[PDB]
Amino acid sequence: VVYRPDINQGNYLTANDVSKIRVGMTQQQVAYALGTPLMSDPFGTNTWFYVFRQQPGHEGVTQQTLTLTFNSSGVLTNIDNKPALS
Amino acid sequence: NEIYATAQQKLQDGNWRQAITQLEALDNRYPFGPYSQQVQLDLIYAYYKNADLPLAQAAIDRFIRLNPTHPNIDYVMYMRGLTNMALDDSALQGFFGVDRSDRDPQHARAAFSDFSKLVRGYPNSQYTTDATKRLVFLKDRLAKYEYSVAEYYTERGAWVAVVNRVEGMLRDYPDTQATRDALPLMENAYRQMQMNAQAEKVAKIIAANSS
Amino acid sequence: IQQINIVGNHAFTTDELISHFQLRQKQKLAGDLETLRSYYLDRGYARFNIDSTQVSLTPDKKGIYVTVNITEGDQYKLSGVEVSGNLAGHSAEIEQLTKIEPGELYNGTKVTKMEDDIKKLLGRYGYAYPRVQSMPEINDADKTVKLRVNVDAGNRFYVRKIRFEGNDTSKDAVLRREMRQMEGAWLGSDLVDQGKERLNRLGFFETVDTDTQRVPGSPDQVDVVYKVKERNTGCFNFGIGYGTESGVSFQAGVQQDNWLGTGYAVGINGTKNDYQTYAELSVTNPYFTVDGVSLGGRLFYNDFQAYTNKSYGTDVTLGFPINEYNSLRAGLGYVHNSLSNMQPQVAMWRYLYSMGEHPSTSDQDNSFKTDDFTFNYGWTYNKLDRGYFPTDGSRVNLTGKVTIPGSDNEYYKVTLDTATYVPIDDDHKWVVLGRTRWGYGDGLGGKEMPFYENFYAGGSSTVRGFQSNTIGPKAVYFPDYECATQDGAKDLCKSDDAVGGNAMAVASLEFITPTPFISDKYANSVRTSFFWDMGTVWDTNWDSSQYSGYPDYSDPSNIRMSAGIALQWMSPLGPLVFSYAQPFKKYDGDKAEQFQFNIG
Amino acid sequence: VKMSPLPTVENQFTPTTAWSTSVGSGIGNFYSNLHPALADNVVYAADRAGLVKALNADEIWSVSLAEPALLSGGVTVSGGHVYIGSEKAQVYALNTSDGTVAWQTKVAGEALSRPVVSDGLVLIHTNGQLQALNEADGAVKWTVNLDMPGESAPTTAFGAAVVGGDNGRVSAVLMEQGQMIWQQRISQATGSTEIDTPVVVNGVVFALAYNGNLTALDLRSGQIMWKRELGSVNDFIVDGNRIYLVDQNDRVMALTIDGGVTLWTQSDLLHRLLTSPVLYNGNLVVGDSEGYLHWIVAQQKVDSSGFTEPVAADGKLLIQAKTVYSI
Amino acid sequence: DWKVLNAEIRDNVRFGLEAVNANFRYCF
Amino acid sequence: DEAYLEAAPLAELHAPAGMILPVTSGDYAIPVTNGSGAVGKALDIRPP
Numbered sequence A: 001v002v003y004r005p006d007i008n009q010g011n012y013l014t015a016n017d018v019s020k021i022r023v024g025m026t027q028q029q030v031a032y033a034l035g036t037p038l039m040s041d042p043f044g045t046n047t048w049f050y051v052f053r054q055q056p057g058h059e060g061v062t063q064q065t066l067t068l069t070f071n072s073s074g075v076l077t078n079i080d081n082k083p084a085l086s
Numbered sequence B: 001n002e003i004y005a006t007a008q009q010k011l012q013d014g015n016w017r018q019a020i021t022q023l024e025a026l027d028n029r030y031p032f033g034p035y036s037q038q039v040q041l042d043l044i045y046a047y048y049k050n051a052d053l054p055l056a057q058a059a060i061d062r063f064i065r066l067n068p069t070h071p072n073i074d075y076v077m078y079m080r081g082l083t084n085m086a087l088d089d090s091a092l093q094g095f096f097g098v099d100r101s102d103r104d105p106q107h108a109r110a111a112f113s114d115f116s117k118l119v120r121g122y123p124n125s126q127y128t129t130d131a132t133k134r135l136v137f138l139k140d141r142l143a144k145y146e147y148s149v150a151e152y153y154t155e156r157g158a159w160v161a162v163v164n165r166v167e168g169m170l171r172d173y174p175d176t177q178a179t180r181d182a183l184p185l186m187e188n189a190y191r192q193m194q195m196n197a198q199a200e201k202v203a204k205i206i207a208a209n210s211s
Numbered sequence C: 001i002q003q004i005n006i007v008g009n010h011a012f013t014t015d016e017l018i019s020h021f022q023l024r025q026k027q028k029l030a031g032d033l034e035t036l037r038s039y040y041l042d043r044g045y046a047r048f049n050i051d052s053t054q055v056s057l058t059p060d061k062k063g064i065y066v067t068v069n070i071t072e073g074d075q076y077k078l079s080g081v082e083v084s085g086n087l088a089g090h091s092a093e094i095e096q097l098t099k100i101e102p103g104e105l106y107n108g109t110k111v112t113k114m115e116d117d118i119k120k121l122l123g124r125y126g127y128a129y130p131r132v133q134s135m136p137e138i139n140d141a142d143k144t145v146k147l148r149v150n151v152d153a154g155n156r157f158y159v160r161k162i163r164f165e166g167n168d169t170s171k172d173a174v175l176r177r178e179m180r181q182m183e184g185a186w187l188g189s190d191l192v193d194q195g196k197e198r199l200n201r202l203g204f205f206e207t208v209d210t211d212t213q214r215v216p217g218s219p220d221q222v223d224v225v226y227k228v229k230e231r232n233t234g235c236f237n238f239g240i241g242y243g244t245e246s247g248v249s250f251q252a253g254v255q256q257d258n259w260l261g262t263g264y265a266v267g268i269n270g271t272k273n274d275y276q277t278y279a280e281l282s283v284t285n286p287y288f289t290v291d292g293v294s295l296g297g298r299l300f301y302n303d304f305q306a307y308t309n310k311s312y313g314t315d316v317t318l319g320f321p322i323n324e325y326n327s328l329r330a331g332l333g334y335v336h337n338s339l340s341n342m343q344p345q346v347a348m349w350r351y352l353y354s355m356g357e358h359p360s361t362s363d364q365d366n367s368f369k370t371d372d373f374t375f376n377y378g379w380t381y382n383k384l385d386r387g388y389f390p391t392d393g394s395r396v397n398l399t400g401k402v403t404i405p406g407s408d409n410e411y412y413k414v415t416l417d418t419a420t421y422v423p424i425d426d427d428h429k430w431v432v433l434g435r436t437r438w439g440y441g442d443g444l445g446g447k448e449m450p451f452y453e454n455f456y457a458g459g460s461s462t463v464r465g466f467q468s469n470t471i472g473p474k475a476v477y478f479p480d481y482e483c484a485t486q487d488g489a490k491d492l493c494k495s496d497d498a499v500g501g502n503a504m505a506v507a508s509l510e511f512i513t514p515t516p517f518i519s520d521k522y523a524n525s526v527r528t529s530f531f532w533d534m535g536t537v538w539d540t541n542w543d544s545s546q547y548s549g550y551p552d553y554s555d556p557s558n559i560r561m562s563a564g565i566a567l568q569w570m571s572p573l574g575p576l577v578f579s580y581a582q583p584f585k586k587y588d589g590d591k592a593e594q595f596q597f598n599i600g
Numbered sequence D: 001v002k003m004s005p006l007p008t009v010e011n012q013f014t015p016t017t018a019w020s021t022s023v024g025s026g027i028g029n030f031y032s033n034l035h036p037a038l039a040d041n042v043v044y045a046a047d048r049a050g051l052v053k054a055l056n057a058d059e060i061w062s063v064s065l066a067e068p069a070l071l072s073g074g075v076t077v078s079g080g081h082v083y084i085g086s087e088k089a090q091v092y093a094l095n096t097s098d099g100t101v102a103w104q105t106k107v108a109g110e111a112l113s114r115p116v117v118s119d120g121l122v123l124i125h126t127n128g129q130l131q132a133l134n135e136a137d138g139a140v141k142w143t144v145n146l147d148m149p150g151e152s153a154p155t156t157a158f159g160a161a162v163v164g165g166d167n168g169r170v171s172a173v174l175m176e177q178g179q180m181i182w183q184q185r186i187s188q189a190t191g192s193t194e195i196d197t198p199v200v201v202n203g204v205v206f207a208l209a210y211n212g213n214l215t216a217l218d219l220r221s222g223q224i225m226w227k228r229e230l231g232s233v234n235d236f237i238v239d240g241n242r243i244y245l246v247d248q249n250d251r252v253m254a255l256t257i258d259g260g261v262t263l264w265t266q267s268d269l270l271h272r273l274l275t276s277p278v279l280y281n282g283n284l285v286v287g288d289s290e291g292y293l294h295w296i297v298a299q300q301k302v303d304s305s306g307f308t309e310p311v312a313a314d315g316k317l318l319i320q321a322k323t324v325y326s327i
Numbered sequence E: 001d002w003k004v005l006n007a008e009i010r011d012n013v014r015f016g017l018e019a020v021n022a023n024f025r026y027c028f
Numbered sequence F: 001d002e003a004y005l006e007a008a009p010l011a012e013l014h015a016p017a018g019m020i021l022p023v024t025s026g027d028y029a030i031p032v033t034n035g036s037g038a039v040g041k042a043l044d045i046r047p048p
């Protein structure tokens, strides 16, 4: 009933770019393809979080979470893609 | 001559309005006269005590620009710190007991920076103990502002603004009270998003640093 | 300048090109040269060139001449528009912006408009810094131009932080609750402007401006800074009027639309004298919940000993938005009203008879009192661009009451306030304003609306130039005027005492102009206008038959009209209004007042 | 600052206007060279509005060339043709006996200078371009461009013209083709805002400009023979081995042709906005802004509206007010 | 700053004394 | 006034085993001072 503005959070992801990521890319190659992360793990690890969250007014919350774990050498070693909330 | 002796008596015993009237009368004195610098310092003091703060700032900037080095330049810098910190207070919010930390912090950041310059530049000055106490106060006054913003975004539901705002507090104000109390907001924000590994890391920090 | 000549003109009369010049001096000369160039570039003369300018003085500098020498071409047509480059989608929207009428006369301004529309189309999707350029291919074999546009979208930008500067009194949450751009989300250039408009509409600030700054060392992030300047919001008023004629006389109160920066709207008033006691308390919370639900209410007490009129009550109102521009309100209230020692008269006793009362004519010794529970409701529409001196948009405020079953009175009342602003000039210094008010109340179940709820009109707030609450029906008394009792006239007597009526209609038209002459210090605080206004109030159920020897107050056609000039000023101590008007159309008993002033 | 008052000197002569008549609307406040001309006992005149008249030397012809024409450049008459310039791009050529228009032609800019007829062509000094037109047609023969920061008319001799504009130089060009012969500096000032008709007598070029650089140059090459501080925008007269000048301050004076010591001055007309001098009946005549004629010893009132260059020929003095008069 | 039976203090504050009509205003 | 003299003392966070807290920035670092001077109303605030 009461109007609630749409809320967006996180960086914008699309299938056309998510399909671009491959094991072995450098941090600069990934940042170029997808852009600068808005979330990272500060507590002593080299992990980037690409969170795509949308909450349209009085609709359900939708979220895609792409987690990238890098080696301390600056090499992508693990990709974990959650397409939806549980 | 007579005007400066009168201004000195008004600064010590008389009215600050009479002291400023007599000191401003000396604006007709030679810029190179024996009291020119002493009068400029007396004017800065009178402007601060009368709350004519815009003019204390202009006169201090002029004084420092014209005399980059001076035996009492550290006194002037200390007065610069007090002049900026004095603009942060307000009589009405004080009278009613309003918690003012949410308002604009621009003046507190400027005062913090100038006191920092004082403490590092002249460690032997008699003013650095009081500047140290005011530096601790200002650092905490700023951390309260960052907390207030994180609390609002928690209420609106912008979970990433909350996570990044608190992460920033952990880099700029690591040891203040507002930071120790801010961690539950990050611990929650990482659970509304399904990021359980970091909610657990934060919970370990909260427990390890618990009273 | 004694003479401005144009050499080589053939398509237009010299006077037509001169009619657009400001010289009628380097800045005016440059402005006129650019105006001439654009004037031709808007009509297909793709090859138009300004070949030379001559500026010279007369002997002894008595005068000056200006001549410009130009070469005209011909009227070119635009054959089509070619768009290429890096379009990150959105090809259909650009193609839609790209559409032109076949053979349409080539126009440089239209090319600029299309280029800007493309930048604004991409900006709402987060492409804050695109590269857009266009250039013609001008043909010789035919009077045609082919337009090429080269677009490179660049990359998407994200917002890192939103900061506020100049927020010295208000809480950061009071500014921030009005934003539409979120931190940590993709940038949208329209959301930032909607935030700017909402900050202006509150009315707490003299100005709001923004800055989108790039983050050093980061190719895709910006910071958004809002800069505001606070205005004084409400004043405390206190005073004493002691004297031996009246004794103690006391008045005090406070009104703020922002209370210490907390966002609450608080109004507290009271006064005491030998004949009247009054008190009022009103508190509203604009955001009881985070979504914009507001909650507030008031208490009042009013004791007038002159007939005796004593009343008190409370009101609780809740309201909530349903759209960006619409909100609804609903609430409850209670009023106790006790009257005694009323002067016998027809309009009042008609009601008293309908309530079942049978007072004795010409004996003022009487009493009547009620306890009434009321349901209140209303709706508001608001899209004005400013709080203090709006220039565009419109506002509508429907409100009303219905008696709750079980109350002593049974009635309903409806009111409707509207206003619309339309600019005349692009700088919004010339504006035309229309204002209207409507209202109607009536009875339920055979009763009439109580006379203490009647509508009144006239005065500086309604129709200017008349004494307050003097427009409308006047009292007709039964047998201080001697006819009030048996010691005077032995029959019905009329008077000039305004009583109001069940229905009201008022309207005005105002022309808002810049101050003819004033320093820049007042450029944003003083505004003047000329106005023409009209209105009328009428009393349904007036018995035009039984009292056919007296004016028939049911006729709504007896419209009163006035016109004059007024000035508004946002004095540091509050809004002030000054006006003068001449009520050129008036009727029997209309007491004029020509010079009027009040605090807003 | 203020103009000197009218002199109190008693008029020692008995001059009078032989006849006068109104002509069109008048030049008024517009500065131009629309002076009258006289040839073969016929007076030719024009008004800025576009009216052109010819009268006997005692109303035989008049036409209006407007559809105003903003006519300028004055009227010059040579043989069979009359040439009238304009502040528009058109130059009008009319027959001298019958006044019917012969043709019109386009030029590169305002024809503010006097149309000068010489060696088969008409020289018009405009936009700073000097153009030579066919004396018997509208065809352009050639143009020459000059630097630029009213325009001075050309003077011709031996098949070449001497011209110069508002720039600091004077130039001489050939009449056969648009070929430059020489250029030289004649003026300088202390500031760019103060930097600015030549004559040739016995092979000596006499140049004058606003600046105080009155200069005498060799005709064949641009070698300066002498220079003096005197300067003025007004036309001047060289005759009898004497130079008769009207100074920038409206001083009236004469000097010798060698640039030697000033022979005499009269300063009682200073700031009265004098016209150029004319030599008539052995005396110099000037008109002022208030309608008085001065003999240089005598003064006479003619027309209180004021004055445009005076002209005289064959014993007649013809002047026009800011209406034509013959004295 | 201060200027004058009545007086003004600065912006936001006016007082008048002038049986009696003593009053003042203080704007926030 | 003396309100600044009531500010709470500073105290750092301990790092839990296996984690490192974020590396701090260079600013807002208060250096160690002797603390030998006067405080509050005791301080001679005037032209030397």
Ligand SMILES: CCCCCCCCCCCCCC(=O)N[C@@H]1[C@H](OC[C@H]2O[C@@H](OP(=O)(O)O)CC[C@H]2O)O[C@@H](CO)[C@@H](OP(=O)(O)O)[C@@H]1O
Binding pocket: C420, C433, C434, C435, C436, C505, C507, C508, C509, C556, C557, C559
């Ligand atoms: C958009 C920006 C805001 C500005 C809007 C401006 C337009 C509002 C017009 C107001 C209604 C016109 C008056 C009218 O026309 N109102 C009806 C009519 O009123 C008799 C008329 O007669 C004419 O000439 P005369 O008869 O005087 O010779 C003069 C006008 C009026 O006087 O008929 C009544 C039936 O009731 C009214 O009823 P009511 O007043 O209750 O609405 C009607 O509305």
